[PDB]
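notes to self, project folder thing:

trying the whole complex as one job this time. last attempt i did each chain seperately and stitching them together was a nightmare. two parts in total, labels are on each line so i dont mix them up again. if this works i'll redo the older ones the same way
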Amino acid sequence: MFTVTVPKDLYVVEYGSNMTIECKFPVEKQLDLAALIVYWEMEDKNIIQFVHGEEDLKVQHSSYRQRARLLKDQLSLGNAALQITDVKLQDAGVYRCMISYGGADYKRITVKVNAPYNKINQRILVVDPVTSEHELTCQAEGYPKAEVIWTSSDHQVLSGKTTTTNSKREEKLFNVTSTLRINTTTNEIFYCTFRRLDPEENHTAELVIPELPLA
Amino acid sequence: MFTVTVPKDLYVVEYGSNMTIECKFPVEKQLDLAALIVYWEMEDKNIIQFVHGEEDLKVQHSSYRQRARLLKDQLSLGNAALQITDVKLQDAGVYRCMISYGGADYKRITVKVNAPYNKINQRILVVDPVTSEHELTCQAEGYPKAEVIWTSSDHQVLSGKTTTTNSKREEKLFNVTSTLRINTTTNEIFYCTFRRLDPEENHTAELVIPE
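result (full assembly):
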């Protein structure tokens, strides 16, 4: 009878990453464009309007300018694929696709955006090589607030000092930095794990105590 | 009307990281898992092959043994998603995906591994308190070779001794250590910049003189 079909309701997408959502519809042997209406829209704003095999840019809501494109290839296989570059937190929400190829249907893909603590900038300071006390630091930003957990190489937990504030890059994200001061020695290994709950999500960087010139 | 699409002809990915390269293909109504064939192989080596619901190890090369895999849930959706863990310098090259389900197609992904000098370890010593002379030191590993540029809280003309070795821990890396000698007051700011070219990449670290 002809119906528009969605590979999934929900996509959890990665902040500052690129987004690809799909609408599927029947393509008998060949695609011809004259017939086709592809129209994507989220919260009433036009992302994309596909008509006579071109895309009507004049109608694309300003805020989607050159950040949203439509594939041209997967149309050909009965797959309407909306690609959104550099995903923002705002980009979370509900997206309607509307296809009309001899039969109009529509679907509604829900889209969550996550900002995982997954780019961990690390650094090590040998504070006083007589005492062997070092200063290991890990910093990163995501959403929501995360804790840092320090562990030795035998997974014993250690006392750190962690400092959360709002990221100055993005207003909605958090900066998290943690510092361990510990007497250790060349080649010893330590971890800093950025955890965050509901659902839990861990990202941890591996820290190797280096060897520098002359004790 | 069966073609493998690729979302990225190119992946630029960080040494030691986790890489998920993807090949998409038309899935209709249901996942005929008993039908599906996916072959992942890069530049004349075999990574993954997946015959009808089953990952066939027997064949795959040994460099991948415990580190390559196919993301299973994704197949349902039309995503032959190959994942590599602990991405090395060798793992760069040209990746092919052979997918058979309905028709059968193949596309190619280029994979670039950057190993940036970005884990910077640092020392500040007081060599002579009467002269307030300090030794500042900075060390980092990467590829290719880097130079170390030292600058100060006013951009004065500094020079140090840079010492490059092969890395003891990740065999293909350079261990570059640089050492600055200088006189200075407390809470002054210097920086050690490590520098690669091709393309010219710069990573810098800030050193604060303790009181």
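what i see at first glance: Chain A touches chain B through 26 residues (CB under 8 Å).
need to look closer tmrw
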